[PDB]
Enzyme design. Structure first.
Site, PDB file in Angstrom:
ATOM      1  N   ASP A   1      32.126  60.110  45.893  1.00 13.43           N
ATOM      2  CA  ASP A   1      30.873  60.317  45.234  1.00 13.43           C
ATOM      3  C   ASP A   1      30.155  59.079  44.755  1.00 13.43           C
ATOM      4  O   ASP A   1      29.122  59.181  44.108  1.00 13.43           O
ATOM      5  CB  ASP A   1      31.067  61.294  44.080  1.00 13.43           C
ATOM      6  CG  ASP A   1      32.046  60.731  43.113  1.00 13.43           C
ATOM      7  OD1 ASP A   1      32.495  59.597  43.188  1.00 13.43           O
ATOM      8  OD2 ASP A   1      32.259  61.514  42.119  1.00 13.43           O
TER       9      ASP A   1
ATOM     10  N   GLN B   1      30.928  57.033  42.564  1.00 16.26           N
ATOM     11  CA  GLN B   1      31.134  56.778  41.151  1.00 16.26           C
ATOM     12  C   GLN B   1      32.581  56.353  40.999  1.00 16.26           C
ATOM     13  O   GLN B   1      33.484  56.986  41.528  1.00 16.26           O
ATOM     14  CB  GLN B   1      30.868  58.057  40.331  1.00 16.26           C
ATOM     15  CG  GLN B   1      29.463  58.577  40.632  1.00 16.26           C
ATOM     16  CD  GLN B   1      28.828  59.345  39.504  1.00 16.26           C
ATOM     17  OE1 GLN B   1      29.038  59.044  38.317  1.00 16.26           O
ATOM     18  NE2 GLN B   1      28.021  60.330  39.881  1.00 16.26           N
TER      19      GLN B   1
ATOM     20  N   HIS C   1      39.143  31.604  41.219  1.00 16.56           N
ATOM     21  CA  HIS C   1      40.247  30.672  41.524  1.00 16.56           C
ATOM     22  C   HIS C   1      40.764  30.985  42.928  1.00 16.56           C
ATOM     23  O   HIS C   1      40.924  30.106  43.760  1.00 16.56           O
ATOM     24  CB  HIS C   1      41.385  30.831  40.441  1.00 16.56           C
ATOM     25  CG  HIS C   1      42.652  30.047  40.734  1.00 16.56           C
ATOM     26  ND1 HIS C   1      43.045  28.928  39.964  1.00 16.56           N
ATOM     27  CD2 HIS C   1      43.628  30.284  41.703  1.00 16.56           C
ATOM     28  CE1 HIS C   1      44.204  28.475  40.541  1.00 16.56           C
ATOM     29  NE2 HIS C   1      44.588  29.297  41.571  1.00 16.56           N
ATOM     30  N   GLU C   2      40.909  32.304  43.216  1.00 22.84           N
ATOM     31  CA  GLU C   2      41.410  32.685  44.538  1.00 22.84           C
ATOM     32  C   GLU C   2      40.442  32.322  45.670  1.00 22.84           C
ATOM     33  O   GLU C   2      40.829  31.778  46.713  1.00 22.84           O
ATOM     34  CB  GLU C   2      41.821  34.175  44.593  1.00 22.84           C
ATOM     35  CG  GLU C   2      42.946  34.530  43.557  1.00 22.84           C
ATOM     36  CD  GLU C   2      44.198  33.614  43.652  1.00 22.84           C
ATOM     37  OE1 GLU C   2      44.479  32.904  44.578  1.00 22.84           O
ATOM     38  OE2 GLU C   2      44.902  33.624  42.588  1.00 22.84           O
TER      39      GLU C   2
ATOM     40  N   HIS D   1      40.462  28.776  46.687  1.00 24.77           N
ATOM     41  CA  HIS D   1      41.519  28.316  47.580  1.00 24.77           C
ATOM     42  C   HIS D   1      41.054  28.461  49.037  1.00 24.77           C
ATOM     43  O   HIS D   1      41.381  27.682  49.903  1.00 24.77           O
ATOM     44  CB  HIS D   1      42.805  29.126  47.422  1.00 24.77           C
ATOM     45  CG  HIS D   1      43.690  28.690  46.250  1.00 24.77           C
ATOM     46  ND1 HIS D   1      44.159  27.362  46.088  1.00 24.77           N
ATOM     47  CD2 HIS D   1      44.265  29.422  45.276  1.00 24.77           C
ATOM     48  CE1 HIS D   1      44.980  27.343  45.031  1.00 24.77           C
ATOM     49  NE2 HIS D   1      45.050  28.551  44.532  1.00 24.77           N
TER      50      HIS D   1
ATOM     51  N   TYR E   1      49.759  22.380  50.113  1.00 21.55           N
ATOM     52  CA  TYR E   1      50.205  23.038  48.906  1.00 21.55           C
ATOM     53  C   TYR E   1      51.540  22.524  48.354  1.00 21.55           C
ATOM     54  O   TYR E   1      52.507  23.275  48.171  1.00 21.55           O
ATOM     55  CB  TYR E   1      50.204  24.579  49.066  1.00 21.55           C
ATOM     56  CG  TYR E   1      49.960  25.306  47.750  1.00 21.55           C
ATOM     57  CD1 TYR E   1      48.777  25.123  47.023  1.00 21.55           C
ATOM     58  CD2 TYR E   1      50.927  26.157  47.199  1.00 21.55           C
ATOM     59  CE1 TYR E   1      48.514  25.820  45.840  1.00 21.55           C
ATOM     60  CE2 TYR E   1      50.660  26.924  46.054  1.00 21.55           C
ATOM     61  CZ  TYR E   1      49.467  26.723  45.359  1.00 21.55           C
ATOM     62  OH  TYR E   1      49.197  27.464  44.250  1.00 21.55           O
TER      63      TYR E   1
ATOM     64  N   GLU F   1      45.345  23.175  43.273  1.00 26.11           N
ATOM     65  CA  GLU F   1      45.330  24.103  42.113  1.00 26.11           C
ATOM     66  C   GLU F   1      44.211  23.811  41.079  1.00 26.11           C
ATOM     67  O   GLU F   1      43.493  24.696  40.632  1.00 26.11           O
ATOM     68  CB  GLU F   1      46.706  24.069  41.378  1.00 26.11           C
ATOM     69  CG  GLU F   1      47.655  25.128  41.951  1.00 26.11           C
ATOM     70  CD  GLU F   1      47.014  26.492  42.018  1.00 26.11           C
ATOM     71  OE1 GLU F   1      46.706  26.983  40.838  1.00 26.11           O
ATOM     72  OE2 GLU F   1      47.009  27.139  43.026  1.00 26.11           O
TER      73      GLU F   1
ATOM     74  N   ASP G   1      58.113  25.044  41.781  1.00 32.50           N
ATOM     75  CA  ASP G   1      56.697  25.290  41.905  1.00 32.50           C
ATOM     76  C   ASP G   1      56.086  24.414  42.926  1.00 32.50           C
ATOM     77  O   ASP G   1      55.098  23.731  42.696  1.00 32.50           O
ATOM     78  CB  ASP G   1      56.047  25.029  40.535  1.00 32.50           C
ATOM     79  CG  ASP G   1      54.612  25.482  40.453  1.00 32.50           C
ATOM     80  OD1 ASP G   1      54.179  26.422  41.051  1.00 32.50           O
ATOM     81  OD2 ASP G   1      53.908  24.822  39.595  1.00 32.50           O
TER      82      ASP G   1
ATOM     83  N   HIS H   1      51.380  24.039  39.829  1.00 27.42           N
ATOM     84  CA  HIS H   1      50.749  24.690  38.730  1.00 27.42           C
ATOM     85  C   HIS H   1      50.981  23.946  37.392  1.00 27.42           C
ATOM     86  O   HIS H   1      50.400  24.353  36.348  1.00 27.42           O
ATOM     87  CB  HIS H   1      51.112  26.181  38.521  1.00 27.42           C
ATOM     88  CG  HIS H   1      50.717  27.038  39.687  1.00 27.42           C
ATOM     89  ND1 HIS H   1      51.550  27.192  40.775  1.00 27.42           N
ATOM     90  CD2 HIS H   1      49.578  27.770  39.901  1.00 27.42           C
ATOM     91  CE1 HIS H   1      50.938  28.025  41.631  1.00 27.42           C
ATOM     92  NE2 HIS H   1      49.761  28.381  41.133  1.00 27.42           N
TER      93      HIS H   1
END
Ligand SMILES: O=C(O)C[C@H](Cc1ccccc1)C(=O)O
Ligand SMILES: [Ca+2]
Ligand SMILES: [Ca+2]
Ligand SMILES: [Ca+2]
Ligand SMILES: [Ca+2]
Ligand SMILES: [Zn+2]
EC number: 3.4.24.27
Length: 316
Positions: free
Chosen positions: A59, A61, A142-143, A146, A157, A166, A226, A231
């Site tokens: 619908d 909504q 942020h995504e 990338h 990375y 990052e 990491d 990060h």
């Protein structure tokens, strides 16, 4: 899907109402034809197979609680696209209006979000550490940044290049948060992190150390976790960027702020023109200086502030 463009209405993760761009074809789909080659939001139905089903609604909504994360992922991707286009004249992440895809309800109790090289993915959080991750515009932006990096500098990375990758994502995610004027700050992920605790966030650009991240090169993490602290060490760059923008005195070094807009112009230029996949912090500094030089002149204050800011975090 092929159908008619329309506008629907729903409520996001934080309970706010917004209008979203949908496409009508028997069902109403979360497919926004108004931006580039489209923005598409999918339901991953608590599984890990991607992308899942293009979001369909009967619908137009979207007030169900299951809908909230889709509404925000879809809406915030549009905003981000707008920021890039309006501000930097860039069409989508590839500069050629590539379709933007995101999936929500990825896995069960998944406390993360990411760009997998083809699309965005958001968990719903476990409800304690996080609520559904697409409720934060800085997370969404942020995504998507990338993706931008992948198509441009291509920063690998890990280690320093990874931390730069990052930091870029946090810097632009924050610039987007200010663009939309959605209670902006220099904190990362505050809107979706620890619903039970007010005032905190995942990372801080204004004072990284607040959460135990480094704010000086001498304090960099040199271990292997990491991906080599992508990060963690991003804090050094984030702090530099905050100083360039806002100014301040840090470890005795004083920086005059030049503002957000110029920060964004300088970083975007560095990213798209000067950085390479293996650039390190020292190369980022040279890039940022060259960019500011290109834009404002070597004897500019702008150039001066970029230098001061890196000197302040110990990047030579
Ligand atoms: O690096 C990533 O894309 C993963 C993730 C994204 C994120 C940003 C802000 C808040 C929550 C989650 C991170 O751990 O930063
Ligand atoms: Ca509905
Ligand atoms: Ca905020
Ligand atoms: Ca924020
Ligand atoms: Ca919190
Ligand atoms: Zn990231």
């Amino acid at each position: 899907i092929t159908g008619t463009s329309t506008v629907g209405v729903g409520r996001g993760v934080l309970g706010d109402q917004k209008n979203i761009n949908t496409t009508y074809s028997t069902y109403y789909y979360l497919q926004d034809n108004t931006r580039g080659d489209g923005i598409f939001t999918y339901d991953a139905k608590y599984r890990t197979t991607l992308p899942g089903s293009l979001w369909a609604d009967a619908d137009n909504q979207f007030f169900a609680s299951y809908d909230a994360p889709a509404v925000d992922a879809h809406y915030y991707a549009g905003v981000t696209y707008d920021y890039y286009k309006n501000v930097h004249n860039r069409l989508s992440y590839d500069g050629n209006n590539a379709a933007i895809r995101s999936s929500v309800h990825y896995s069960q109790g998944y406390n993360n979000a990411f760009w997998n090289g083809s699309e965005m993915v958001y968990g719903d959080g476990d409800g304690q550490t996080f609520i559904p991750l697409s409720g934060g515009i800085d997370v969404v932006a942020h995504e998507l940044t990338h993706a931008v990096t992948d198509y441009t500098a291509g920063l690998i990375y890990q280690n320093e290049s990874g931390a730069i990758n990052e930091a870029i994502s946090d810097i632009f995610g924050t610039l987007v948060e200010f663009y939309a004027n959605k209670n902006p700050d220099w904190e990362i992920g505050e809107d979706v992190y620890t619903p039970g605790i007010s005032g905190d966030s995942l990372r801080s650009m204004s004072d990284p150390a607040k959460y135990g991240d480094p704010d000086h090169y001498s304090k960099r993490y040199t271990g292997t976790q990491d991906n080599g602290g992508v990060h963690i060490n991003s804090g050094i760059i984030n702090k530099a960027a905050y100083l360039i923008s806002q100014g301040g005195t840090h470890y005795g070094v004083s920086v005059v702020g030049i503002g957000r807009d110029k920060l964004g112009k300088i970083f975007y230029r560095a990213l798209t023109q000067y950085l390479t996949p293996t650039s390190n912090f020292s190369q980022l500094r040279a890039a940022a200086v060259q960019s500011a030089t290109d834009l404002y002149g070597s004897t500019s204050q702008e150039v001066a502030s970029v230098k001061q800011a890196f000197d302040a975090v110990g990047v030579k």
